Symmetry: C5
Subunit: 394 residues, 5 copies
């Protein structure tokens, strides 16, 4: 009886076009905040943050007021979209095809004319995802909000701290914080200044998934490549091992392209890490070819250089701690015996070449092993957030 | 005649904005339930449950009542969206881009003013999918429902048991149950408490598909890796077999990434199982390199250590149950014969090294076979639901 | 003049909320049928049938009637959505995110008050796709239609045979038929019975595409695996051939997962067929290892068992139809000659082992060839629709 | 002043439900045409043509007429959707989920009551894509348009030639033409005939992209397979080459499945071309096994058949243009010499077998080379549009 | 009080259908510009530019004017869609399924009747993406805008320079500029000329991502192929290396097809670059077969041609800087010695053939290395924007 009566009274002569101020010269104060419930998706390839947010808009409507002693029990009323004036606050950096992802809900108004509006929404925003340090990256995604059509002389937008009390954690992103800033800009369209409120979602990637599915594999594929330097040359499988490892690694790096954006702001950390890993496998194939050249050297070919004889078989090797009728019968047997002696000298020359191959193989094992460790450790720890990541996620 | 007459009468002065209570101070009781018809999709990568549900809302409208003796034959009326007051019950944890997936249908009202509203919908909800025990995982997906704008002082939301009598089973998920709980929370927005109703869909993954397409393959790819320990070394294909098996396995694990979310709450069970499988193939390649080192050992190189001579050729081997002119002619033939004897000693040394390779190869066959079984059995049965899964799905 | 006049008259006092019956106690008869124009997509992974349908609804509106002698030339009128009462017939088992895929069109009404409504639509329905016999599978997809809000006491839904006269055949699915059934169910929501009409689209997969792209390849990859049993062992490539074939086959089976649903109702026919094919390649690698063990047997190792000497070199082999100073010089040459004789005996032992490898290789060629044929023929013909498929598609 | 005045006058008593004819018995003539601006996508897997079209509808509204001497300067007026009667022309064979893709725009009306309506739209239509001759295929995609609810007695739909003057060429499809045909059909729903207008978009695939990315590769993968017949057998890599080529080819054919529909109307041309290519690689592996069998033949095994000795080493080979104490010492040396002679005879037998392998290898090189050329040329030129394609695209 | 009063006054008798001109004969001047905020996506496979734009429309409404001395403090008013006349400016070359991607916002009107309308939107436009020079390509994407229904006699559309002052740079595309052009065309539909405004977004691809992920790999896969010419032939792995490299490269080129459109306007630059790379690997396999033919030549086969003996072992080689009872015993030993001499001559012939293989191998190393460099450098630098790209991105 009193609710029906009040609704009929509150709409009499009410225009949702009118900004609901008592004094038309003064701006209307709109308090804008939001509640962050969930981060639904961070698309690094499309540069789009998807969040579940409850926008919070509160203002005062001069015309929607009543004495609660005359409509007893009616402390609040509710109005749908199109029936009450609302601030036209939009997400400026929207990525939604519809642009406005807000789900329009009721505006709750109490007797003193205070209006509360909390529309939910799945918001897609355009966020510059800096993948320079991926997977140890921290992201700062801005959500800029302001009135589209009402400038600062008509709508005085103020900011209230964002609420994260009902935030649901994400298994992939750690919410560092959601600081907000109110600013007033000028636009070429418009001499009047237009205030906006920007909430910067600060997000730390949780690195357990990427550590075990992307970074530890490369170590394993880098360790497999090093096993070529322990395969004997006579096995006949050092190129099979090395080139198969590089095939696997190339396929592995293709799968990684699915996640990164095709941008040129910087060369990511994963790309540098891949470059190091690529180098280990590519140069182990090059070195493997050299080792096979030494192993399969023709004993009747070019004699072993003096530099090769000393740098490998002496210095490196020590460092590595490797180390009538009867006359005619005589002629035939002597030819057979001299032939055998020639084979003995030739295979001794081959043995020297094979030993040099082993020394080169062992030298490069140590060199590639150490260089693998330094590049892995150096590239990873160059990330500012690596130490934080291992302490919090591992 | 009486239906036309009643519709004209029931809408006279009716305001869909008014909460349809006789006493404005009292809250309106809304009974909320739902019917679960089908689970359409569980997206573990996007963390979203898609269900086909018929929401069930029933309340009493004080103004939509008539005497059936005056409108004979008219026992019920129906009203579309916008013409009758409805509770603004939404899915709080919605993942739909539109947020509200409800398909608006009629409200059915009988003569005593009781209103029934059963809107269908394809609902997308944000469900935390715990993949710690995947593929033997049970999921608890919450569907939280409440009035967006009406707090507890205005809308007294009560819960009624969910209906699963028209539930259509899913080939992938077994519906354990759909328990529901009514709760009343406070929000930072609002001093007034807002009641909600949360239905927890409890779902057990049916594991036949994942057992045959994801878990039994790993056993087969783990068994293929073990066959390297039965290949002769002279075949020249033990690295080809081992490294090809690991290429296959890496490709296999790439395909598995398509299904899991990139989250860091925990390391899944499939990841641990893959880690065990990875270890078998990776260490069988490492052991294969060692076996080839033994097999291809240079007979003029470092003599066999005493530890190697006893630990392998004696202990392990027994355990494994393996086990003038005429003077010049004399000089030539004696050199030929002594040369042959030197080859005999050298190939005897090689035979010892080759036999040690066989013992190491057989030792690691047993060790990797047993360790493969324990890790497979141990990792799988560590899942709480493994025993239930095999009894119900296999 | 008469069309304008009639439209003004027909809408006077008309309420689209009112069920258009003369007697409010009696139900309104609605004849429901449909026209199937095309099957657009059968998504076996999402379990959703997409069809192009023209729903057919016809009823009688008591208020939309006129004498054609007073509005000459006006034999029919047309009304858009919202202006005329329509039955709220929905697809119960809808998979569309909007739930209602119907495109709202005009209702055509003639002078006697008969209303015809033929809204087109791209309908997505939830169909249980039984892949037990894929690719020789027949599907029965139900399309259940009924009034959402009007029960049997208010809307008497009758069924009329579906029309397929403008059906456009699908290159992948053969329309067996579209039988329909009217039924009346009770729901927990509602004491009143609610009639529905279910049209069961019966669809036979056309198997030419799947025969040539999925079943004949497996035969070719099963035939390639058999070629390992004709490769000589000295070629050194029997593991390369066998393990490469299994790599190809594994990749091939990954591509097949894209089409099947991750369900556990049954193990499909293609899975069983893959299991047979998997067995041929996996056991040919196991047998290849055994053949290489025999071929590369150490002539100074364990003597050939008596069971091996008879079961292979006799029975199987026959069945397979294979089959002073001068004294010192004497000592040296005799050692050389005796050494050569020892090599002759040892290589004779090796030749026996190599021959046993050939017999085992030929025995398994026949066994795997026959077993390959039986499993291929047996698994395929176990499908009830295999004979029909080959006669109609091949 | 005169525009405002005219709009108020033209809407007085106007009903958008009324067909705007002076005589209600006569049908209304609607001229239907369209403008083809672009072909946006041809989805051969979903069988859907996406086009950018400007529909062209023109008719005469009897009520929207004025004297331009009384509203000077007002030669035309414009009306939005819902305010003026429009023909309900739809795309019958629509594939859009909404069914109607038309973007509703103004209707332009001049003083004589002539109405022009040119709504743009991104139209998705169901087109039967005949892939029998892909990639040298010509497509005929129908776009059928007619009034949904107005039959021939009420709306006389006439056709006007389609406009392609603003057509933007597609890099993949060459617009042969867009002929149109007006027809009048009967439907089971309706005794009244319903006229339709069907525009057949005739499209020729431009084959440069598919020639270089799909057809020339197969030639290269067919040429690589032929190189197995020039590899020496002692290289030990003829199975590695052949089986790797077939692995590559299988992966290549998987990528091709992404483009073709899973239909059984016919076996496409690319499938036949793949079958030829598959045969070359598969039979080159089979022949490679036979060549290795000949090369690795046991010299103490079955003697060379007489058919083999003549068909290969003579006919084919010519055609191919290949071609006391001292007595005891005597016994030992004679055994050594006789042993060597036995090796010479045995390796001579092996040399004959190795030469037969070379002849078979060279015979199959020529046979597979010629057969490769004929199948490539024969399968490609069997397409009716192959000659046109090479002249226009190459 | 004055805002409420003004809104009631401004809408009195206002018709949003009327073009708001004082003189109905004169056209209405509409100033059209836009603001480019971000380029969201360039889809080269679908030929669609996605941009975030703020359209800028300004005109004068003759009826929406007031004296600010009578409504003090009210300097501007705002009107939503449907309440005020707006120009129906559309994107002609739209690719959006809805066609109109504009988000409708308020029109801001000041006291002198000047109207400002700045609707935001995510616009999808049909852009011809010329991939002739990809990845060093510059794109010119047109965005054509004009009134759909108002021709030049009714709406005089003028252009204002586009604003890029709030443009957010894209990590992949460098905004060269956004020039605009006003033009007036004639259409077959319409005798009246229709003005349009076309803004050409000029975009330069940033090439760092494509240089490191697509162009440098090909160099690495081209360098790996060259390593076959340094592998010894006795290693037995030159076909394994070469054919594995080509497998990797084929897989690499499959991944590249995901990005390019299936168009035939031209053969892209990446395709030509791939053709060069393909040639290096394919001809290195062909040359590898020839080298193996030389290496494995039968010493009892066709003698070395005179051309081969001079062109390789002399010219190329120098250029490359390579370089009673006792009588019977005599017969046996002489046969053994003569047999050994025959082996020495035969292996000397083999050594000559093996040396020729090395020379051919070294000759082709230099030839393929130089030819690889020229094709890489020549194909890349043939792009007009290559020099600009390396200076700006590298
Ligand atoms: C457990 C993991 C495996 C861990 C390690 C590899 C296991 C095998 C190494 C030992 C082989 C035996 C040997 O002979 O070693 C030699 C070299 O050994 C060294 O000096 C260093 C060997 C370790 C290299 C570390 C990187 C391995 C690759 C990554 C591995 C992970 C791959 C990925 C894992 C899935 C020394 O012995 P020697 O030949 O007697 O020396 C000659 C001296 N003499 C003539 C006087 C006798
Ligand atoms: C505007 O109003 C002021 C006072 O209200 C008056 O003096 C002036 O003449 C008016 N001018 C116009 C626009 O008629
Ligand atoms: Ca992410
Ligand atoms: Ca699932
Ligand atoms: Ca299908
Ligand atoms: Ca196409
Ligand atoms: Ca791009």
């Amino acid at each position: 009886e009193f609710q029906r009566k009040l609704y009929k009274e509150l709409v009499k002569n009410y225009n949702p076009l009118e900004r609901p101020v008592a004094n038309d010269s003064q701006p209307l104060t709109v308090y804008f905040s939001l509640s962050l419930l969930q981060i639904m998706d961070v698309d690094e390839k499309n540069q789009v943050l998807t969040t579940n947010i409850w926008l919070q808009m509160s203002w005062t409507d001069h015309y929607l007021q009543w004495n609660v002693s005359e409509y007893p029990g009616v402390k609040t009323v509710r109005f749908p979209d199109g029936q009450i004036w609302k601030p036209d606050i939009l997400l400026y950096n929207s990525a939604d095809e519809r642009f406005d992802a807000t789900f329009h809900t009721n505006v709750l108004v109490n007797s003193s004319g205070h209006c509360q509006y909390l529309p939910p929404g799945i918001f897609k925003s355009s966020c510059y995802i800096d993948v320079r340090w991926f997977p140890f990256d921290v992201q700062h995604c801005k959500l800029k909000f302001g009135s589209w059509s009402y400038g600062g002389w008509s709508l005085d937008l103020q900011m209230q701290e964002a609420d994260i009390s009902g935030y649901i954690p994400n298994g992939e992103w750690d919410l560092v914080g959601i600081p907000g800033k109110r600013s007033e800009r000028f636009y070429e369209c418009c001499k009047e200044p237009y205030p906006d409120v920007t909430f910067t979602v600060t997000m730390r990637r949780r690195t357990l998934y990427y550590g075990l599915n992307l970074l530890i594999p490369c170590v394993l594929i880098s360790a497999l490549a090093l096993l070529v330097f322990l395969l004997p040359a006579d096995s006949g499988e050092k190129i099979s091992l090395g080139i198969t490892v590089l095939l696997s690694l190339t396929v592995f790096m293709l799968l990684v392209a699915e996640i990164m954006p095709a941008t040129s702001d910087s060369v990511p950390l994963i790309a540098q890490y891949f470059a190091s890993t690529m180098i280990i496998v590519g140069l182990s194939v090059v070195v493997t070819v050299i080792v096979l050249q030494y192993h399969h050297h023709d004993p009747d070919g070019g004699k072993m250089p003096k530099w090769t004889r000393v740098i490998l078989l002496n210095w490196c090797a020590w460092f590595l701690r490797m180390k009538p009728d009867l006359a005619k019968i005589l002629e035939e047997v002597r030819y057979i015996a001299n032939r055998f002696r020639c084979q003995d000298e030739s295979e001794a020359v081959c043995s020297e070449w094979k030993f040099a191959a082993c020394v080169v193989d062992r030298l490069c094992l140590m060199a590639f092993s150490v260089f693998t460790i330094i590049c892995t450790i150096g590239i990873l720890m160059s990330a500012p957030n690596f130490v934080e990541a291992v302490s919090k996620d591992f």
